[PDB]
Amino acid sequence: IFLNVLEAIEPGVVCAGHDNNQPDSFAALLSSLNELGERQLVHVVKWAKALPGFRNLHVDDQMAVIQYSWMGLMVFAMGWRSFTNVNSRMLYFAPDLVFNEYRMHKSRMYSQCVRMRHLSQEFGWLQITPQEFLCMKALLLFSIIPVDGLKNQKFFDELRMNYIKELDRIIACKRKNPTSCSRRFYQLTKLLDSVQPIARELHQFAFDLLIKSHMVSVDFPEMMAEIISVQVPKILSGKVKPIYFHT
Numbered sequence: 615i616f617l618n619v620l621e622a623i624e625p626g627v628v629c630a631g632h633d634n635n636q637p638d639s640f641a642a643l644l645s646s647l648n649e650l651g652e653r654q655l656v657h658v659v660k661w662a663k664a665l666p667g668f669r670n671l672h673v674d675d676q677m678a679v680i681q682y683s684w685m686g687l688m689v690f691a692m693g694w695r696s697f698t699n700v701n702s703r704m705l706y707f708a709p710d711l712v713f714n715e716y717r718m719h720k721s722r723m724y725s726q727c728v729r730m731r732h733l734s735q736e737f738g739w740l741q742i743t744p745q746e747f748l749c750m751k752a753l754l755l756f757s758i759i760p761v762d763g764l765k766n767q768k769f770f771d772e773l774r775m776n777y778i779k780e781l782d783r784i785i786a787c788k789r790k791n792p793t794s795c796s797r798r799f800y801q802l803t804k805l806l807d808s809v810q811p812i813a814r815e816l817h818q819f820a821f822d823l824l825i826k827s828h829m830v831s832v833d834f835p836e837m838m839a840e841i842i843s844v845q846v847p848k849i850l851s852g853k854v855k856p857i858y859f860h861t
C-alpha cells in the first residue's frame with residue numbers, strides 16, 4: 615500500500631515559464647530558476663501533506679520539515695528527471711529550462727551544477743529503481759531538523775524510522791532479490807547522504823543572490839524570498855542540520 619501512495623501522489627511535470635528566445639543571461643536563468651522554485655514549492659507542499667503518516671506530525675513541524683528539506687527534495691527529483699529524459703547529459707530542471715554547459719557556466723553556478731549532474735549519473739551508475747527513487751525521495755523530507763529538535767520530536771522519529779524500513783523493504787521483497795540486501799543499502803544511504811552537501815552549496819548560493827538580488831536584476835518570487843531569508847539562514851547558521859546516515 616505504501617508504494618501505491620508514493621506512485622499515486624507523485625507530482626507531474628512543472629514548467630518554469632522560461633523565455634527561450636531571450637539570450638542566456640545570469641538574471642534570466644536565475645529568475646526562471648527562482649520562478650521554477652516557487653512553482654515546485656507549491657507541488658512539494660501538496661505532495662508532502664499527502665504522504666503516509668505525515669499528519670502524525672505536529673502542525674508547525676509539518677511545515678518546518680518542508681521548509682528545511684525543499685532544496686534537497688527538488689535537486690534529487692531534478693537529478694532524476696535528468697536521468698530519464700536525457701541520461702544525465704544536461705540538467706533537466708523543467709521541460710522549458712534545460713541547462714547545458716553554456717547555461718551551467720552562464721548561471722555562475724558551474725561547480726554546483728557539476729555536482730547535480732554527478733548525482734543524476736549515480737541514478738544510472740547504480741541502476742536506481744523507480745520504486746527506490748520514490749522511497750528515497752520520501753525519506754529526504756525527514757532528513758533535516760533543528761538541533762534542539764522539533765515540537766514533537768517523537769512523532770517525527772516514528773515517521774522517519776518507518777520510512778527507512780520501507781526503503782529497506784523495497785530492497786528485499788521479491789523483485790530483484792540478491793543477498794545484496796546490504797551492499798545496496800550502504801550505497802543508497804550513501805547516495806542519500808550526498809544530496810545534503812549539494813543542497814548546502816545551493817542554500818548558501820540562493821542566500822547571497824537574494825541579499826544582492828536587486829543589484830543584479832534577479833527577481834525572487836514571494837515564497838522563495840521568505841524561505842531563503844527565514845529558513846535557510848537557520849540551516850547555514852547551524853541551528854538546523856541534516857541527518858546523515860554515515861557519520
Ligand SMILES: C[C@]12CCC(=O)C[C@H]1CC[C@@H]1[C@@H]2CC[C@]2(C)[C@@H](O)CC[C@@H]12
Nearest residue numbers: 647648650651654688692707816819820
Ligand atoms: C530548487 C530549484 C528549483 C527547482 C529545481 O528543479 C531545481 C532547483 C535547484 C537550484 C535552485 C532552484 C530554485 C532557485 C535557486 C534557490 C537559486 O536562488 C539558486 C539555486 C536555485
